[PDB]
Amino acid sequence: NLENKTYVIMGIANKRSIAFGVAKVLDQLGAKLVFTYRKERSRKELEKLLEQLNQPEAHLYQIDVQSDEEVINGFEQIGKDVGNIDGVYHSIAFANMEDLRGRFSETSREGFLLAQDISSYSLTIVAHEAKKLMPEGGSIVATTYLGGEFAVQNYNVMGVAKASLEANVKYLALDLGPDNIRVNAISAGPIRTLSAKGVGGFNTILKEIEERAPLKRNVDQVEVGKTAAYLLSDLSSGVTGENIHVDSGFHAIK
Amino acid sequence: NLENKTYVIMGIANKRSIAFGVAKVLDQLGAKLVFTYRKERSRKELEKLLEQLNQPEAHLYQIDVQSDEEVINGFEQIGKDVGNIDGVYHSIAFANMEDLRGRFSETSREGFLLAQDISSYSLTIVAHEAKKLMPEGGSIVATTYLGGEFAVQNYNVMGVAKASLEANVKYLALDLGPDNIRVNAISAGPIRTLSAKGVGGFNTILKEIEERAPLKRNVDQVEVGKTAAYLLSDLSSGVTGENIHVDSGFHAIK
Amino acid sequence: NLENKTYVIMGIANKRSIAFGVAKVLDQLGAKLVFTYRKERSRKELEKLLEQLNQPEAHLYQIDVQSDEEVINGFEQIGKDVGNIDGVYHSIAFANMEDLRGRFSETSREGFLLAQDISSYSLTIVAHEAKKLMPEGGSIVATTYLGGEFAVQNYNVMGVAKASLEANVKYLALDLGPDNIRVNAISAGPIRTLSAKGVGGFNTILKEIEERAPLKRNVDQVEVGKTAAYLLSDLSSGVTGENIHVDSGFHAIK
Amino acid sequence: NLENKTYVIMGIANKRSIAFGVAKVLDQLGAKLVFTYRKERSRKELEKLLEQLNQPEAHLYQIDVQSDEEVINGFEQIGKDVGNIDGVYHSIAFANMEDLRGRFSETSREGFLLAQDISSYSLTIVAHEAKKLMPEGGSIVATTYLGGEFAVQNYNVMGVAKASLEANVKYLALDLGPDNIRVNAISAGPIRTLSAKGVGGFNTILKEIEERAPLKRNVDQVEVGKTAAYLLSDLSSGVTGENIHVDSGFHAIK
Ligand SMILES: NC(=O)C1=CN([C@@H]2O[C@H](COP(=O)(O)OP(=O)(O)OC[C@H]3O[C@@H](n4cnc5c(N)ncnc54)[C@H](OP(=O)(O)O)[C@@H]3O)[C@@H](O)[C@H]2O)C=CC1
Ligand SMILES: NC(=O)C1=CN([C@@H]2O[C@H](COP(=O)(O)OP(=O)(O)OC[C@H]3O[C@@H](n4cnc5c(N)ncnc54)[C@H](OP(=O)(O)O)[C@@H]3O)[C@@H](O)[C@H]2O)C=CC1
Ligand SMILES: NC(=O)C1=CN([C@@H]2O[C@H](COP(=O)(O)OP(=O)(O)OC[C@H]3O[C@@H](n4cnc5c(N)ncnc54)[C@H](OP(=O)(O)O)[C@@H]3O)[C@@H](O)[C@H]2O)C=CC1
Ligand SMILES: NC(=O)C1=CN([C@@H]2O[C@H](COP(=O)(O)OP(=O)(O)OC[C@H]3O[C@@H](n4cnc5c(N)ncnc54)[C@H](OP(=O)(O)O)[C@@H]3O)[C@@H](O)[C@H]2O)C=CC1
Ligand SMILES: CCCCCCc1ccn(Cc2cccc(N)c2C)c(=O)c1
Ligand SMILES: CCCCCCc1ccn(Cc2cccc(N)c2C)c(=O)c1
Ligand SMILES: CCCCCCc1ccn(Cc2cccc(N)c2C)c(=O)c1
Ligand SMILES: CCCCCCc1ccn(Cc2cccc(N)c2C)c(=O)c1
Secondary structure, three states, X not given: OOOOOEEEEEOOXXXXXXXXXXXXXXXXOOXXXXXXXXOHHHHHHHHHHHOOXXXXXXXEEEOOOOOHHHHHHHHHHHHHHHOOOOEEEEOOOOOOHHHHHOOHHHOOHHHHHHHHHHHHHHHHHHHHHHHOOOOOOEEEEEXXXXXXXXXXXXXXXXXXXXXXXXXXXXXXXXHHXXXXXXXXXXXXXXOOOOOOOOOOOHHHHHHHHHHHOOXXXXXXXXXXXXXXXXXXXXXXXXXXXXXXXXXXXXXXXX | OOOOOEEEEEOOOOOOOHHHHHHHHHHOOOOEEEEEEOOHHHHHHHHHHHOOOOOOOOEEEEOOOOOHHHHHHHHHHHHHHHOOOOEEEEOOXXXXXXXXXXXXXXOOHHHHHHHHHHHHHHHHHHHHHHHOOOOOOEEEEEEXXXXXXXXXXXXXXXXXXXXXXXXXXXXXXXXXXXXXXEEEEEEEXXXXXXXXXXXXXXXXXXXXXXXXXXXXXXXXXHHHHHHHHHHHOHHHOOOOOOEEEEOOOHHHEO | XXXXXXXXXEOOOOOOOHHHHHHHHHHOOOOEEEXXXXXXHHHHHHHHHHOOOOOOOOEEEEOOOOOHHHHHHHHHHHHHHHXXXXXXXXXXXXXXXXXXXXXXXXXXXXXXXXXXHHHHHHXXXXXXXXXXXXXXXXXXXXXXXXXXXXXXXXXXXXXXXXXXXXXXXXXXXXHHOOOOEEEEEEEEOOOOOOOOOOOOOHHHHHHXXXXXXXXXXXXXXXXXXXXXXXXXXXXXXXXXXXXXXXXXXXXXXX | OOOOOEEEEEOOOOOOOHXXXXXXXXXXXXXXXXXXXXXXXXXXXXXXXXOOOOOOOOEEEEOOOOOHHHHHHHHHHHHHHHOOOOXXXXXXXXXXXXXXXXXXXHOOHHHHHHHHHHHHHHHHHHXXXXXOXXXXXXXXXXXXXXXXXXXXXXXXXXXXXXXXXXXXXXHHHHHHOOOOEEEEEEEEOOOOOOOOOOOOOHHHHHHHHHHHOOOOOOOOHHHHHHHHHHHHOHHHOOOOOOEEEEXXXXXXEO
């Protein structure tokens, strides 16, 4: 039960956002939810979305994770507006569609470092700031993909970013363990999201999952949300630096 | 919420049993619980224990996992007495204290194969039978230790048994995925159990955990129970073939 | 260069044996080679094989790894006949074709424990004895398959055995590190061997390898032999407890 | 035997450089060696070093891996001066000593992205260019550390860079498998190098290695070189996307 719990959810873009699947679940558990977005234009569509939730007031903040300030300030503000929080969900990442199509060896330096910045570092600084709002401790969860652990056809630069992220988690988990903050990640299966749109051979994989994954099916944002809850809750106390695959156990086969 | 859910808990020896830490948690969630023991003499002490739970009736069955029958029959009987179940918790293992003290290379063939039998195979056959009581599917969880993934001083033969077990889980998870049965494992941190008694230097490790583990503390049977619940519940739907470390994130460091 | 080096090669059944691919390579490096076989009937075919090698004398010993003695004695004898050795190659394993076809959950206890015995334990005892012939230290290598790390369709019980083996290596590596003995394993790609014959969907995999493996091709006994040499030689000094995938990098993808 | 083989060695700073330990070994095998350095001032000290090798002519090129051009041009030039090559050794990495001392969560964005750039991306672009000099294929090897796989006290940001690198390898290995180029990495144990100087907790670890590592000792640049040779040679044909721990098997314990 998540009453008296307040979580920050970063990275909602639409009803298909994975971070939304999470929100639904948390909301359904009576958690007070706070949200962050990148561009203004999103914000309206956003508020439109919230209405499907039993959130008394809508607490929306605009943070683009590339700006040290937008993050530092953004959080401080939340600290002022809602006080302390219990945890953060991090559903943010980016890469140039080019660098995902081209051969990986052709990947550009900007494209590379960019993905590293948004998809991995963001977590570090976010944690550092969120820490300030979790005096008695709390839980942080980030979203990764199997391509962080293996070379996945076409995932290219994003793969390396995820790999980087998955390590980020461990180092954070260690750094903040003492401050009683748990840091874990969810390796999600492929899901039909905004960003999932436009990727080559996506549909192929979804099918290969059904055909090969132990559960012979695919996963959804809710299932992720559920695991997310486990992780954000005291249920997963004692679990830190872990990466949980919510992917029909596709990770376990070969 | 675990009303209308019925789980079989194997491997309770006492109040310090990990499997007991699990039971408490499940009971506290309104699950109907069934138990199994190896020797009669335990059974009394056992009933004595249950009394701390809000279990209407006590359903205790005697199964030594070395006997193909005791298992086949034991389960069938449960099927008759309680009908279908939602899952099974497997907290069973054994190894000869000799083989854990001696150099690993000196390990005897019996000692070796014995541990494999009780600590790993047991799961396989248990799953096969439990399957019959989970028509609409369900969840199976086994308990492993970090020593299944790395050579841990002194864990010796038990290490290899766990390794074996952790693979057992994956192969099972794959085999029974279609039948909608999830199979996962919990890599527990060191806990003061009956069997934990008598192990060389154990106390050293417990301390090293506190000193090195991200959370700078140790874990208990409850924390495991909690994760166990996550895994046994529909919360962990979409998670199969996974090994979750409930160990203060000690698994993540080096 | 492998003159003045003497290695024991266990598990040759024919010209297609992986252990043979190894032998060729070692022989080609001037190593003195010793061999072991299970049944008499093999021995003749064996001697027939050796003739393709520049081995002055043929040193063949009969050891079935299920017999504690055949191993203890077998080695002692070698110790008497050839004195000290530099290392051992272990290309032995077994499982019942039944248990590989049936669902994994249906696996029989004998079938299970049998595979564990031959495919994993064998190593332990072999090491213990070979140790006696390597006073200044040496190198031991065993052969595993990817299915020890992931649930591979149909590998079933053999998978778990390999998993067990891969751990055996680590625990041995640790145990004998001080005695300056390195213990490592080769995760080989699928190769057309005697035992490879009769397995379901084998041909499928070989193709999937070519199509998906980074090298877009398959591997042979020689390539393994080559890596084997690296491992058995002082080249791989400082490497112990490692598992090297000679599989066109298939292990690295997903 | 490495006659008729030409390899590019990047990242020599002094006689203690790991890349130097490699060079010695390769030179000792009759390989034609090409070198790269970052700053001019190094170059002299460098030529001074070469003299210890049986290299007919010294082929030294200046490439700082942060410049897309210095790399593109640098290689093209080599292509003109020495024609085609057989492979590349990558012994380059950097991170700000600050970010390694501070808590990881405090890591600055520049510091972070910088390490990613030099320590990981560099490989990608280097590969892309070196590819052009390896028409019939070849082998690329990079140097990583255990902290890429686990949170290692103090390794902080460099850890994440290595993690990133280890993924880079896999994705490259896959991308260039078809062009018959193998890409692998060496996870080296701690070694007393120029850069190793100034790290906190260094001497401690070196000792913990001796005390805990299976081989109960430490490793040197040569041992690495040796494995490097295995990897760069046709010996490791069939091995790609692999990470080999040359660390006295410390990786295997816990
Ligand atoms: N979809 C899938 O199959 C998988 C997804 N994941 C991961 O899940 C997470 C969410 O992806 P998903 O929900 O699928 O789809 P979404 O694209 O809906 O969510 C991603 C969010 O990231 C936001 N974002 C991007 N860059 C920044 C930035 N610099 N600052 C702030 N926000 C930013 C986007 O905002 P906007 O559009 O408003 O800019 C969007 O809200 C990511 O970490 C992704 O890697 C992992 C494995 C599989
Ligand atoms: N304690 C720890 O620190 C750790 C424990 N674990 C694992 O957690 C699980 C629980 O162990 P733990 O709680 O430590 O101690 P427990 O002794 O409570 O649990 C082990 C149980 O196994 C039972 N058992 C043994 N052999 C058989 C058999 N052939 N058939 C049926 N039951 C059998 C024992 O019953 P009886 O005495 O009646 O025979 C005992 O109740 C085990 O799988 C263990 O390996 C993992 C990591 C660390
Ligand atoms: N083939 C492949 O694709 C792969 C094979 N491997 C591994 O490589 C190794 C060699 O298999 P492979 O060479 O392919 O095929 P083989 O069948 O030619 O070799 C297996 C060997 O095991 C021996 N053996 C079996 N039981 C015993 C025993 N009790 N005592 C002594 N020797 C015994 C057999 O001897 P005999 O017939 O004389 O009893 C035979 O020489 C095995 O460990 C296998 O697991 C790993 C990955 C892939
Ligand atoms: N030392 C250890 O224990 C371990 C080291 N490693 C790795 O081994 C590699 C070599 O480190 P090591 O040999 O230990 O010590 P060194 O510091 O002697 O070598 C590092 C070299 O990298 C060069 N370099 C750094 N940045 C650049 C750049 N931008 N462009 C070109 N060259 C650059 C340096 O050049 P210069 O000074 O001339 O500018 C120097 O020659 C690194 O990748 C490191 O991460 C991995 C595991 C353990
Ligand atoms: C080529 C394999 C495709 C696997 C699909 C899983 C997936 C789908 C989407 N995303 C998000 C993503 C991927 C690539 C670029 C961007 N910007 C974003 C937000 C992921 O990180 C991962
Ligand atoms: C060398 C470190 C000791 C391991 C501490 C954690 C632990 C404690 C107990 N057990 C259970 C165990 C260990 C040894 C023998 C037996 N029979 C049993 C049931 C484990 O598997 C593991
Ligand atoms: C289901 C995937 C098949 C993978 C083939 C690779 C392989 C081929 C042969 N062997 C040896 C083997 C396999 C099966 C049964 C037996 N007895 C033996 C000795 C292995 O352990 C592994
Ligand atoms: C607390 C763990 C210490 C491990 C020392 C091993 C090591 C020693 C040196 N280096 C190179 C290094 C380390 C730190 C900063 C920089 N710039 C560089 C190039 C490594 O990447 C790794």
